[PDB]
Amino acid sequence: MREIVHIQGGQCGNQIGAKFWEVISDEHGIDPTGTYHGDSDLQLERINVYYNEATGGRYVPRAILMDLEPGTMDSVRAGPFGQLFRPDNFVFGQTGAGNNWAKGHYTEGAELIDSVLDVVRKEAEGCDCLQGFQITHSLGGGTGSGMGTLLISKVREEYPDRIMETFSVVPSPKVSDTVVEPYNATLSVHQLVENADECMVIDNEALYDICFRTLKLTTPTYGDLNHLVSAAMSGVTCCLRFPGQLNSDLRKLAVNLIPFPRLHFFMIGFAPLTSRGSQQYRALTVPELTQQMFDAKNMMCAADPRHGRYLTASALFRGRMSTKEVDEQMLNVQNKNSSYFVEWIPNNIKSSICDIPPKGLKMAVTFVGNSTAIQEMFKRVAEQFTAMFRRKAFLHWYTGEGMDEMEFTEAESNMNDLVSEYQQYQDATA
C-alpha cells in the first residue's frame, strides 16, 4: 500500500539510483539474483513499497532509467545489484544533449520522452495505491536539467493530487566542473519551482567537506558521496516501510514542513557518522545524536544555517528509544537557540520515531530543515547567471535551437523574485 516508483535520468540520476537501490537491497536482504535471504519477518511485510513480485519468487524494482546517451546505463548494468533492473525501463538516446538545455528539453528530449512517459504511465497504473513520485537529478548537466524537469511538468499535468519529490544536485562554484552550470541551473530552477512539490538540494562541496572532516578519510570518492546520499534518501522513507511509534508519511511531512506553496526547498542531514577510529571511542546516545544533528557543519549543503533563521525542522529517528527524552532534547535545543528560530510560529519542529534501526547501527537520525539560509546559493547562482548573461556569452547555441533571450529574462526575474520573497519572511516580525 501507498507505494512509490523510482525514476532516474541522466548520469547523476542513474548513478545515485544505482546505490540507492543497493542500500535498499541491503536493508531488505535481497540477493543480486532476486532471491530473498533475510532474517526478520518485518523485511517482507512492506516489500511491495519498492519491489514488484514476479514468477519464481523474485522481486524487481519499480525503477525507470532514462538518458539521451546509453553509456551510463550500460555501465550501471555492470555495478553490483545492477541485474535487478527490468530491461524494458532502460530508455536511451542515440545522439546526446551535449550539456545543452535546449537540446535536452526542446528538440530531442520532447521527441524521446514519449516512450518513457508511456512506461511511467504503465507503472503508475499498475500499482495498487499510488502515493507519489521521487525524481533524482543534477542541475549541472544539460540533458538532466532539461528532460527531468520537462518530465516533472508532464507528470504534474497528469497527476495533480499526487506528491512529487526532487533530489536536486545544484552546481556550486567551488566544485565547478562546467562553465555553463548557471544557465542550466537557473533554467531548471525556473521550471522546478512551479511544479516540484518538494525539492532538496545536495552539494558536492558539502559532500567532500563532510568526507574530509567528519569521517576524516583521506580519499573521498564518488562511491562515498553516493553512499551518503543514499543513506539520507532511505532515512526519509524508512518509516513508511517499517513500523514505529509515530508514523509520518511524505504527505504528512509536506503538510508540516511547507508553510507557503512556493517555499519547498530543503537541506538535509544524517547522523551519526564518525571515523573508524572514533567508532568504539564514541557512545551512541540521544544527546550526542541531536548535537551532531543540529550542528551547522553537519548539513548536507555548503550554506551556513547560522546565517539565517529556521522556518521549520523535521526529525526521523531510527531505533528503539524513549519519546520523552527526544521531546525534552528538542525542547532544550529550541530554547537554547531561540535566536536562530522564527518567532511568529511556535513549535516549528516535527518528530517521528521508527523502531527498526538501519543494519549495522543501533540508532539513526535524519534531519530535514527549511530555513532562510538557503538564499546564498540562489544569490550566487543568480550573480553568475547575470555575469555570464550581461555580455550574451555562449547564447548562440541556445538561440539557434528555438528558444530566445526573453525566456532567459523571465527566468532571471522569477528567480530574483523567489529569492526576494524567500528572504522577506526572514525579516518578518509579529
Binding site: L215, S275, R276, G277, Q279
Partner: protein, 51 residues
C-alpha cells in the same frame, strides 16, 4: 677449583624473571563508510594519510 680439588662440578641455578602484562585493543568493525584502507588510517594515527 671445585672440579679438580673437590671432584664436584657446580651446576648454576636459573631464576624466574619479571614478566610484564600487556593489554590488547581490537580493531573496530567496518561501519559501512569509505573503504578499509582509507578508513583504517583514523584508528592507526590521529592525522590520516592516504593509503
Amino acid at each position: 677449583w671445585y672440579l679438580q680439588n673437590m671432584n664436584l662440578q657446580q651446576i648454576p641455578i636459573t631464576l624466574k624473571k619479571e614478566d610484564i602484562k600487556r593489554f590488547y585493543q581490537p580493531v573496530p568493525p567496518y561501519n559501512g563508510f569509505g573503504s578499509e584502507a582509507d578508513s583504517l588510517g583514523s584508528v592507526y594515527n590521529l592525522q590520516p594519510k592516504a593509503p
